[PDB]
Amino acid sequence: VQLQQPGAELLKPGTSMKLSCKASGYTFSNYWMHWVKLRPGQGFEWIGEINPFNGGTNFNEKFKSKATLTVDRSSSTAYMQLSSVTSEDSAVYYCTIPLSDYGDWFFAVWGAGTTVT
Amino acid sequence: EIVLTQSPATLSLSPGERATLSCRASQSVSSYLAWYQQKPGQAPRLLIYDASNRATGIPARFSGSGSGTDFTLTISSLEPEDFAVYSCQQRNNWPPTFGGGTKVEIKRA
Amino acid sequence: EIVLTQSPATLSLSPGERATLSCRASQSVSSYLAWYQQKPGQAPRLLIYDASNRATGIPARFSGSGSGTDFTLTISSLEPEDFAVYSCQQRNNWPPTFGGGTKVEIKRA
Amino acid sequence: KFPIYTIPDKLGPWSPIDIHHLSCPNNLVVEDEGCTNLSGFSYMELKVGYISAIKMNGFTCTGHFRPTPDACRAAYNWKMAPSVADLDPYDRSLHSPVFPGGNCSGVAVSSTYCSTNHDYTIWMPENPRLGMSCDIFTNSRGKRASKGSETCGFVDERGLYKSLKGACKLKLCGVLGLRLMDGTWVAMQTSNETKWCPPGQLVNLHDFRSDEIEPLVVEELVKKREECLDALESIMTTKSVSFRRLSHLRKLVPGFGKAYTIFNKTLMEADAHYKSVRTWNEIIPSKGCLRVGGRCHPHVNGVFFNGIILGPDGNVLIPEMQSSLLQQHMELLVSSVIPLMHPL
Amino acid sequence: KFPIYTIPDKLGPWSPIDIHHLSCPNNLVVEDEGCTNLSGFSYMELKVGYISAIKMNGFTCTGHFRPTPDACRAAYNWKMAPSVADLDPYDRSLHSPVFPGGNCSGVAVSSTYCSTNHDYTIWMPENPRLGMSCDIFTNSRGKRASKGSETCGFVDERGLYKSLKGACKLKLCGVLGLRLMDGTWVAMQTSNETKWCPPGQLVNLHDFRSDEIEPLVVEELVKKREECLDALESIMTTKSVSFRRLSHLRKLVPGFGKAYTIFNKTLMEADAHYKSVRTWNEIIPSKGCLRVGGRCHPHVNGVFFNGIILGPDGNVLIPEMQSSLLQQHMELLVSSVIPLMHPL
Amino acid sequence: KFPIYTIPDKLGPWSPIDIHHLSCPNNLVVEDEGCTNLSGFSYMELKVGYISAIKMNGFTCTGHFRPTPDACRAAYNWKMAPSVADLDPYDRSLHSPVFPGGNCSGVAVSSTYCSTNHDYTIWMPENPRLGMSCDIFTNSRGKRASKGSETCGFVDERGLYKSLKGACKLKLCGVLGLRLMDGTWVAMQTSNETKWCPPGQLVNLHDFRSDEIEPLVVEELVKKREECLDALESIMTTKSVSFRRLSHLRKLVPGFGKAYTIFNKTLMEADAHYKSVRTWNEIIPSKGCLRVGGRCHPHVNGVFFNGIILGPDGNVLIPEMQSSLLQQHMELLVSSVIPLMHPL
Amino acid sequence: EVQLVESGGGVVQPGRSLRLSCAASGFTFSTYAMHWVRQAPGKGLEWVAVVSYDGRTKDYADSVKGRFTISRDNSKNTLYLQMNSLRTEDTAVYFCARERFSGAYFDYWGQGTLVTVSS
Amino acid sequence: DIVMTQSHKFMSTSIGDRVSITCKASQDVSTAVAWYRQKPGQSPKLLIYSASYRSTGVPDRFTGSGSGTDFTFTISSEDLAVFYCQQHYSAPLTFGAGTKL
């Protein structure tokens, strides 16, 4: 019932970067990962969700092709890959899953939080 | 009859700029949405059908996106002939229903 | 719903005496009548079913007779535990119907 | 009030059956509109083609005598240059008419084979002696309806309300979901202590009418069931199926059901998610096109499904449509004898 | 308004028949409530198993050539280590499909035999060349309804009103009674000069509706007759009977009628006095019990009568009950081919 | 509101058919009473026996090998000591099941023969290689209804209103008339520029209900069509016809239609002009008489037409009449297998 | 020995709802039709409702129909009577009776729980 | 896309925790609004789901109510942090700006 994140990450603008969220305690295959980001003072925005069982993902229309969501399903961890300029994208990225149901859209447990530039 | 909501009603931009038109359905219409471009005193023209496919003889700058309730029409580069009224039509249910139409206009100083 | 008439309502006798209880049906119920013995604050007990057969674990002093409209329950020798309320039930038709019940009491000088 | 027609929104693969696997549709829809708080959620439902059962696609080899499953394996390789079976996810017991009473419980640990009803012939799985039923899910979205805390039902992507009343908990590859009594399986854990789902699958009594759901509605429900039973009894006594009799097995309400067709004198079934049809112009836009799933459905030899065939002039002949137009075609009345699917 | 079901209050012995002896029931009840003076009386009615006809239980012997009924008698003795026939009480003429057009008038005085429709084969009575139809009565009681002096009808022990309108005088072993047009024979001489009863038995036109008995009632009467005729025509064209088609020959009203069943792929009939069933709990108290005559009716191979069978799980499957519950069983739709009862 | 019965006022010759030429009747009558000016006129209509098609009465000769039509002509002469065909008057193209897809277009100029569907066997016209369709008219009289100038319809000698709506111009032996969509051809030129009549004959869609003619009326129209389709599908699946199933193909309204019967286990059809029957006393005056065309219709082997047969007692058994009287006869339920009419 | 214990009876205001529960032991509860029979004070027994051995078929007395609802739980071996719109004359001692496997009779009854319907 | 709006500043009453936070729904959301509490150095904590119900571990004094587009939440526990409102009615999910308290 916890997710592990690097905590911070630094990279120059225009370079692709990848994130990870190791988790344990819920078999990792039944709960959607529901990646979100916290802009510094402009509030959370929903990036997208991924189903770890089959890798099926749903993305925000405003966000969409900015990043992609993958999954390993061997190690209980999920990955985000960013293909965009790091400038204007500096925020704390969260990974969080619901616990009331497999795929409810309100998130019970959250990740530690990682900062990108 | 289900209501296709098209916002914004008026969309003023400049040539050579991306135009983003959004159609929102009262209930999910799956992937069965169509986009029609109509100019004053001229027959409406089918641009995008099935929300992604491009009709025959349509320039590649017109693209469709979305499924279910929210859809999107994008013009990659607004040419001077792309400033018309754009209307979204669905048939996931009977009867066929259209959106209110979004007018694309040239902006000036 | 057909009415099972049970007369007499009150039947006072003495231990060691034959008790004759009669059930009369509004219309013929064939041989489908049952007799239930119920004591105060205790579950009713099926004594006689099919108007002749004796239920399991029932003393041989209880006997059933009759068919059609008129039926009869007889206790060969009233033991001190046989002074209860005795009710006749039929189902030849829906719904199951009971008699009004006949109370057997000890008589005294 | 049934629609004029129902067309499969999503249609699964066609698998051959015999006339004894045909069943009357469940034309009953539950409203369950006692709750009004709607919340969105994402879930995995069973992929079309797996809602009813998971197929094995085995083969029957004839020696006679009792063969050893080595020469038959080589013979099967030479032969192509089948005989499916169904598992029960609760216990992983194979189901097939050839199996005596079905219930081939031992397939991996108990034994590597189980013989058919006929003693001499045996059946062997095409795949290794194990059951793979994991990649059988598709991701969906819906609007939950949960009153205070107990879920009534949800409205899926197709706008159809699917109630969780009577739903039975069932686990598929580690995902404990709910098997709705309309047939579909949904990955929901909202049920707190609903009864674990009995191994009687969908053949069990569906109830849902002993709650006395407007006995006037059940009047036409029973009437339609009697018409379908007349068609089904005629099919089984005559051992032959026409397109007009096959049109009586179509589900009259939107939801999950079975679609049937005859492909080369073989009775087929497929998982189908029916949707309501309001006008005949919805499903026949042009002369020879049947619109299924947003496209011209591809006919084979001129037959689509559920009694729909291509006419001699190239018109799509829907038996329900033709009867409403007072048009008669001998093509829709031609009875084709269905050969027995499993002789051994 | 028909009851939900009718169950035999009294059921006679089962005698094999062919599909051509099946008949649609008489679902018509006469009220005849123009009289209100009730007087009790005792009478003899025909015992169940004799209301329709009296059986002979004969045998057919095959030589070919024309045999002499001495070797066949010895052969019959060795064979066990049949073929019934019906008499007409008005004239004592044997009736059987093997007899050419029936009507074997000479059995005692004219001749000691009568050949079958096939010339070579002959039929011989098991009993001596005489007809015993005397110990075929049971004693009953009833409430007469006679208006001034002419009897309308009576209410028998089962609470059923049996009218004497149209009754025909018929004499059985010196007891001149009345054959009611519902089928039963009652030992009553109250009729003064009613017409002597024609030898056309119950196959003759029953009328009772040309009196215009509420043409709205006759509407559903004719509808039920048409449904039964559809079932019967299907049975005769397909030459096979299913339990759901056999359930259509059940009498829909209380009174005397026929009960049908299949015992080892043999079509059976029996005399039955049907009674109205108000609830399904009346006739199915426990899991596998059908309550007939105040007891668990004994099934043979899982079939009771009138399409009722024992299910795979042990439940009593009444086709009328299952349809009301929207439950479908392939066991009730399985058509069994009935072999021809009299090949010769 | 259909009549209780319809009887052929005029009946044409009986021509053998197979069960695949059976068709459901057109039970639809058009009123077209928007005009009120009546003028008398005389016309030629198609003689009964020619409204549907004109027969050739050919023969099929079997050699095997390909014979030359000289020995077969001699063999045909020796054999008697057939196999009809239909022409299309628009193009003179022969129609027959033996012809592959029909349409033997070349009979006089293109070729002197056209082979059957089977390669070896050939069919040869009895008459010379030409089509005579001139002496096929009968003179009639009627009351025209033409509104201002465009004719609505006419009332013929039988008092029946025949509308010209949808009528198609068709020319028979130099007389350009109109083929009414009820089937009949009438020698009228009143139509100014109505469409020339397509070669699809009466098999084409009759429409006449897409005009939304009181959808309540079309409800029972579709119900009757469904009953007839059930009977026809049963006939084609079982390949056998009973008299009660043949009674379902009778036209339920007065007008031109088809009459069917079984003569010596051969399915027959004939052109018939049905008239409304108000009472059963109209058509059965005496005990064994069926009144058709003002006379006792002559039965052959006890069968008249449209399921009507002579009973065992000599009574005329009309299946519609017997059902209304709640009388059942096994004679009306006996299914006779129809041998295939054209094996080659 | 067959044991039937019914509970849930108590004082209820008129027009309210009460639910009775009967626990069965000593027999196969899933193969028997269980009835509810009530005895009003100073009156004879009166059949109330029946549920079939599978619970699909239910019947009620005319004075009871439309207000009460019988149900059963074969897994719990428990029989339920849901009394609604309780009126003054609905007060009685309610017995849960077991029907004979073949018969029309109640071979085993319960002790009986008293229901009082008065404000 | 169902924009959620708030007032980003609210005065702190300290122990007198009777402050109400309102989140406005542009479109109909039924009761699908969740309330989060994020301390400056903590991961966000789900407080109220379905806009009126308590999740596991939430203090008893916390409560919420609302339907349609009102979605007013009253704080009742320090715990002085920014509160966020989302909508779990329809995708894509949108969070509120957040009211620091």
CA E282 – CA E321 distance, rounded (Å): 12
Q: What is the DSSP string of chain H?
A: ---EE--SB----TT---EEEE-EESS--TT-EEEEEE-TTS--EEEEETTTEEPTT--TT-EEE--TT--EEEE------EEEEEE-SSSSPBB---EE-
Burial class (CB in 10 A: 0-12, 13-18, 19+), G22: buried
Are C106 and C14 in contact, with CB atoms under 8 Å apart? yes
Q: What DSSP state is assigned to residue E206?
A: -
Are B34 and B88 in contact, with CB atoms under 8 Å apart? yes
Measured between beta carbons, the chain D residues lying within 8 angstroms of F206 are 326-327
- Per-domain boundaries in chain G: 3-117
Nearest-by-Cβ selection for B94 from D157, D278, D294: D278
Q: For residue E230, give the chain D residue with the closest CA.
A: D230
- Sorted by sequence, the CB contacts under 8 Å of residue D276 that are 6+ apart come out as D3, D6, D253, D254
**Residue E201: how many other CB atoms lie within 10 Å:** 16
- Sorted by sequence, the CB contacts under 8 Å of residue G24 that are 6+ apart come out as G2, G3, G4, G34, G77, G78, G79, G96, G98
Distance from the Cα of residue E81 to its chain's centroid = 32
What CATH code is carried by the domain that includes residue A29?
2.60.40.10
CA F181 – CA F169 distance, rounded (Å): 11
Burial class (CB in 10 A: 0-12, 13-18, 19+), E178: buried
Q: For residue B72, give the chain A residue with the closest CA.
A: A61
Amino acid, single-letter form, for residue F48: V
Q: What is the DSSP string of F221-282?
A: HHHHHHHHHHHHHHHHHH-EE-HHHHGGGS-SSSEEEEEEEESSS-EEEEEEEEEEE--TTT
Nearest CA-CA distance, residue D330 and chain F, Å: 7
ω before D254 within 30° of 0 (cis)?
A: no
Distance from the Cα of residue F52 to its chain's centroid = 6
Nearest-by-Cβ selection for F328 from E24, E210, E238: E24
**Strand pairing class (C10-13; C102-106):** parallel
Q: What is the 3-state secondary structure (H, E, C) of chain D?
A: CCCCEEEEEEECCCEEECHHHCCCCCCCCCCCCCCCCEEEEEEEEECCCCCCCCECCEEEECCCCCCCCCHHHHHHHHHHCCECCECCCCCCCEECCCCCCCCECCCCCCCCCEECCCCCCEEECCCCCCCCCCCCEEEEEEEEECCCCCCCEEECCCCCEEECCCCEEEEECCEEEEECCCCCEECCCCCCCCCECCCCHHHCCCCCCCCCCCHHHHHHHHHHHHHHHHHHHHHHHHCEECHHHHHHHCCCCCEEEEEEEECCCCEEEEEEEEEEECCCCCCCCCCCCCEECCEECCCECCEEECCEEECCCCCEECHHHHHHCCCCCHHHCCCEECCCCCCC
Give F300's strand partners. F303
- Chains D and F: 3 or more CB pairs within 8 Å of each other: yes
Q: What DSSP state is assigned to residue C99?
A: B
The H or E element that residue C66 is part of is: strand C62-67
CA E298 – CA E14 distance, rounded (Å): 13
CA E286 – CA C28 distance, rounded (Å): 25
Angle at F189 between CA F185 and CA F194, to 5 degrees: 85
Nearest CA-CA distance, residue D211 and chain G, Å: 9
Are D53 and D274 in contact, with CB atoms under 8 Å apart? no
Please tell me whether residue F57 adopts helix, strand or coil conformation. Answer: coil
Chain B residues with CB under 8 Å of a chain A CB are: 65-66, 70, 72
Q: Which residue has the tokens 């019940």?
A: C101
Method of structure determination: cryo-EM
**Strand pairing class (B33-38; C10-13):** unpaired
Are H85 and H6 in contact, with CB atoms under 8 Å apart? yes
Are D54 and D136 in contact, with CB atoms under 8 Å apart? yes
Measured between beta carbons, the chain B residues lying within 8 angstroms of D279 are 94
Neighbors of chain H with 3 or more C-beta pairs under 8 Å? A, D
Are D13 and D268 in contact, with CB atoms under 8 Å apart? no
Give F258's strand partners. F271
Burial class (CB in 10 A: 0-12, 13-18, 19+), D286: exposed
| Subunit contact A58:D139, Cβ cutoff 8 A | yes
CA of B24: how far to CAs of C84, D42, E104, in Å? 79, 20, 88
- Sorted by sequence, the CB contacts under 8 Å of residue F305 that are 6+ apart come out as F8, F11, F259, F260, F261, F270, F297
Distance from the Cα of residue F227 to its chain's centroid = 20
Q: For residue A22, what are its two tokens?
A: 């190791």
Please tell me whether residue F118 adopts helix, strand or coil conformation. Answer: coil
Q: Where are the alpha helices (DSSP H) in B1-109?
A: none
Nearest-by-Cβ selection for A106 from H34, H94, H97: H34
Nearest CA-CA distance, residue A61 and chain B, Å: 8
| Subunit contact A43:H95, Cβ cutoff 8 A | yes
Measured between beta carbons, the chain A residues lying within 8 angstroms of D137 are 53-54
Please tell me whether residue F202 adopts helix, strand or coil conformation. Answer: helix
Are F224 and F217 in contact, with CB atoms under 8 Å apart? no
Chain D residues with CB under 8 Å of a chain E CB are: 20, 23-24, 28, 205-206, 209-210, 218, 221-222, 225-226, 229, 232-234, 236-238
| Subunit contact E222:F330, Cβ cutoff 8 A | no
Domain count, chain A: 1
Angle at A28 between CA A23 and CA A30, to 5 degrees: 145
CA F275 – CA C38 distance, rounded (Å): 76
Strands in E59-61's sheet, in edge-to-edge order, are E59-61, E122-124, E114-115
Nearest-by-Cβ selection for D238 from F28, F206, F237: F237
CA E266 – CA E19 distance, rounded (Å): 10
Nearest CA-CA distance, residue H96 and chain A, Å: 7
D31 close to B (CB below 8 A)? no
D282, D283, D295: best to mutate for the B interface, most B CBs within 10 A: D282
CA D141 – CA D45 distance, rounded (Å): 10
Measured between beta carbons, the chain D residues lying within 8 angstroms of E335 are 233, 236-237
First and final CA of chain D: distance in angstroms? 44
Give E196's strand partners. E169
CATH 3.30.930.10: does it fit domain G3-117? no
B27 close to D (CB below 8 A)? yes
G38, G45, G52, G65: best to mutate for the C interface, most C CBs within 10 A: G45
| Subunit contact H53:D37, Cβ cutoff 8 A | no
| Subunit contact G56:D195, Cβ cutoff 8 A | no
Strand locations in E204-296 (E) = 240-241, 255-262, 267-277, 291-292, 295-296
| Subunit contact D205:G56, Cβ cutoff 8 A | yes
Nearest CA-CA distance, residue A39 and chain D, Å: 24
Q: What is the DSSP string of E39-96?
A: EEEEEEEEPTTSSS--B--BEEE-------TTHHHHHHHHHH--B--B--TTT--BB-
CA B97 – CA B33 distance, rounded (Å): 10
Q: For residue E312, what are its two tokens?
A: 């795979």
Helices D215-238 and F215-238 cross at an angle (nearest 10°) of: 30
Q: For residue C47, what are its two tokens?
A: 């004594």
Are F308 and F244 in contact, with CB atoms under 8 Å apart? no
Give the CA radius of gyration of chain G. 13
ω before D319 within 30° of 0 (cis)?
A: no
What is the resolution in angstroms?
2.8
Q: For residue A36, give the chain H residue with the closest CA.
A: H93
Are D338 and D22 in contact, with CB atoms under 8 Å apart? no
CA H66 – CA D94 distance, rounded (Å): 52
Amino acid, single-letter form, for residue D126: E
Distance from the Cα of residue D111 to its chain's centroid = 30
- Per-domain boundaries in chain C: 4-106
Please tell me whether residue B34 adopts helix, strand or coil conformation. Answer: strand
Give me the CATH topology for the region H4-100: Immunoglobulin-like (2.60.40)
| Subunit contact D175:A101, Cβ cutoff 8 A | no
Nearest-by-Cβ selection for F326 from E225, E232, E236: E225
C100 close to G (CB below 8 A)? yes
Q: For residue G66, give the chain D residue with the closest CA.
A: D212
Nearest-by-Cβ selection for D330 from F20, F206, F210: F20
Q: What is the DSSP string of chain A?
A: -EEE--SEE---TT--EEEEEEEESS-SSSS---EEEEETTTEEEEEEEE-TTT--EEE-TTTGGGEEEEE-SSSSEEEEEE-S-STT--SEEEEEE-SSSSSBSS-SEEB--EEE-
C70 close to E (CB below 8 A)? no
Nearest to F145 by CA among F255, F32, F46: F32
CA D256 – CA D201 distance, rounded (Å): 15
Nearest CA-CA distance, residue G74 and chain C, Å: 23
CA F59 – CA F98 distance, rounded (Å): 11
Q: Give chain A's largest Cα–Cα span.
A: 39
Q: For residue E267, what are its two tokens?
A: 């079509």
- Chains E and D: 3 or more CB pairs within 8 Å of each other: yes
Please tell me whether residue B103 adopts helix, strand or coil conformation. Answer: strand
Are F142 and F156 in contact, with CB atoms under 8 Å apart? yes
Q: For residue D66, what are its two tokens?
A: 């009792």
Amino acid, single-letter form, for residue E56: M
Q: What DSSP state is assigned to residue G90?
A: G
H42, H46, H55, H89: best to mutate for the A interface, most A CBs within 10 A: H46
CATH number of the domain located at residue range(s) C4-106 in this protein: 2.60.40.10
Angle at F280 between CA F274 and CA F285, to 5 degrees: 100
Are D129 and D69 in contact, with CB atoms under 8 Å apart? no
| Subunit contact F326:E233, Cβ cutoff 8 A | no
Angle at B91 between CA A60 and CA B78, to 5 degrees: 55
Nearest-by-Cβ selection for E157 from C68, C93, C94: C68
Burial class (CB in 10 A: 0-12, 13-18, 19+), B58: middle
ω before C95 within 30° of 0 (cis)?
A: yes
Chain E residues with CB under 8 Å of a chain F CB are: 20, 23-24, 28, 205-206, 209-210, 218, 221-222, 225-226, 229, 232-234, 236-238
CA G3 – CA G24 distance, rounded (Å): 6
**Strand pairing class (B10-13; B102-106):** parallel
Measured between beta carbons, the chain C residues lying within 8 angstroms of E141 are 68
Nearest to F121 by CA among F91, F143, F98, F93: F98
Q: Which residue has the tokens 């996106």?
A: B65
CA F259 – CA E52 distance, rounded (Å): 40
Q: Which residue has the tokens 């001149």?
A: E176
The H or E element that residue G84 is part of is: none
Are C5 and C23 in contact, with CB atoms under 8 Å apart? yes
| Subunit contact C94:E294, Cβ cutoff 8 A | no
Nearest CA-CA distance, residue D210 and chain G, Å: 6
